[PDB]
Amino acid sequence: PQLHYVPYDTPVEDVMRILKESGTLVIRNFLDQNTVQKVQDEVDDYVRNWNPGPKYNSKTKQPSNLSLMSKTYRCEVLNHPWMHAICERMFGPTYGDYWFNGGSILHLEPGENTQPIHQDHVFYQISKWRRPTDPDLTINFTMALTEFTVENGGTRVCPGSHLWENGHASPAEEDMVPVLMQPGDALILPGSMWHSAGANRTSEYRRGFATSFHPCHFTPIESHHHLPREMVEEMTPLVQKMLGFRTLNLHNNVKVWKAGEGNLEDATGL
Amino acid sequence: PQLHYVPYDTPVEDVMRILKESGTLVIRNFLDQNTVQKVQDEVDDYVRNWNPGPKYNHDIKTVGSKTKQPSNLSLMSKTYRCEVLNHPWMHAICERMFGPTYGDYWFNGGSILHLEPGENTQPIHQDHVFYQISKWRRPTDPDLTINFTMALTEFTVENGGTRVCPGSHLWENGHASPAEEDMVPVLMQPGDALILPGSMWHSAGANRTSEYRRGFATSFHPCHFTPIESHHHLPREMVEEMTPLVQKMLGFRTLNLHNNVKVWK
Ligand SMILES: CC1(C)C(=O)C=C[C@@]2(C)[C@H]1CC[C@@]13C[C@@]4(C)C=C5C(=O)OC[C@]51[C@@](C)(C[C@@H]23)C4=O
Ligand SMILES: O=C(O)CNC(=O)C(=O)O
Ligand SMILES: [Fe+2]
Ligand SMILES: [Fe+2]
């Protein structure tokens, strides 16, 4: 197996076949450039109400959920048709519905050392029961804000390591394949794929942001039930279901996250 | 394996050992008559107006046409969310069941189990059947969920008291359901509770009496599993009256995995 770079118009069955054979791939031009700029603008404006001027003439905010800080994220990025097409083919037949697991802005500082090589599904206890041929427990879409180079610690993966067994040792550093991307490209990251961020040996930050989804029956990393309800009703029904505001359906048609025996969105006037 | 009826003050690891041996047991006087009567008073009209049969269509054809199974118990009963969900036996067993592997646990779901007079026998089933990952689990693994079926009316063989097949929790994933003859009826007075791990094969009996047989259940499952019932549609003044334990049970607090990783944060 190898690391594949495919254009945006690659057929869905080709992307799924590459995901099954290599455990990862890169979809170039996943987002346009202005979308890349909008997400950084809204995040910067959130966590920093003040920016240093040229000379001396509430101040900052701790970062929160990406859907809270970025309106383009919760209203445009989370509606990405590629993510939903990949999530449906990955979780539909086995689990059925899926929803948002977690997401944040990647910020590799200058001089930051190499991240330990790991699989994303390590924090799932049921990963010990899972076989390499079973569907993934979660999938991550890592979008590039800056360019991803070997110098600035771009993401490295090991194609084929997703088919390793549960007791397999971590891949050697010599066999990690760096993911070279331009802003707008996305690296698709199933929870079975071993990966790690490299060391940033440059003088500039390596910036990115990630989305991630997992089956309906698994508890996500973040809860969004603290977001303002006026911010909830300006989302699409699909995004509302992603962020835990709607009832989900199992493959056996049993509904989880219900409002008693009814739908959660019906009981909340959504 | 055999069905055990133990008193309320039975040692906790004795209950855990019986759960490991026979896959089920009964804790008598699990609820005092005050709690049984308060729950019956707070859900009387709610069960009265509830339409029988399944509310929505799913593949587990198990809700008979003369069976009422309404949930939303915390929203409809203050005794349920302010006393029942704080029951020390539920948490003492859930800790030893889910702690050593999954870390935290929380509320999965809770329903009223109302058998109208004339209801036929329920299909024998395992409660974790709606878990897809149940086909990856082995009998020696920890349970995916645990249930506490508490008797509101008395539970007899004739009125449809729940029946269990002790030891069936050790059967493999492909083993056939128990025949009707190997089911053992559970005889419970108002107050007793039947402890049902997700692996125990069980079913409700036929209500061949003139009266309805009603109980109500509480279920808990690991922190990393999505509950069958959400509770964020409840009024906020209703959440502020819960204990910190119940607020965490019903999804209003951050959960801790076994390796100290935050979920639902
Ligand atoms: C379809 C039905 C009747 C069944 O045949 C097998 C499993 C489930 C899907 C029930 C209805 C709802 C549940 C959902 C819940 C989380 C709480 C309910 C309950 O309290 O009693 C039935 C349940 C159960 C014990 C079993 C579970 C469970 O674990
Ligand atoms: O009502 C009973 O005695 C048992 N009911 C169930 O197991 C159920 O509804 O899933
Ligand atoms: Fe990672
Ligand atoms: Fe059951």
Numbering used by the authors:
A (entry chain A): 4 to 60, 68 to 280
B (entry chain B): 4 to 268
Give the original sentences from the paper that presented this experimental model:
Asn65 in SptF is uniquely substituted with threonine in the closely related AndF. To clarify the function of Asn65, we constructed the SptF N65T variant, which converted 1 into 5 as the major product, with a slight amount of 4. Notably, in the crystal structure of SptF N65T-Fe/NOG/1, a hydrogen bond was observed between the C3 ketone at the A-ring and the newly introduced Thr65. These results indicated that a subtle change of the hydrogen-bond interactions affects the position of the hydrogen atom for abstraction and determines the product specificity. As a result, N65A significantly reduced the 4 and 5 formation activity to 20% and accumulated 3, suggesting that the hydrogen-bond interaction with Asn65 is not completely essential but moderately important for the binding of 3.
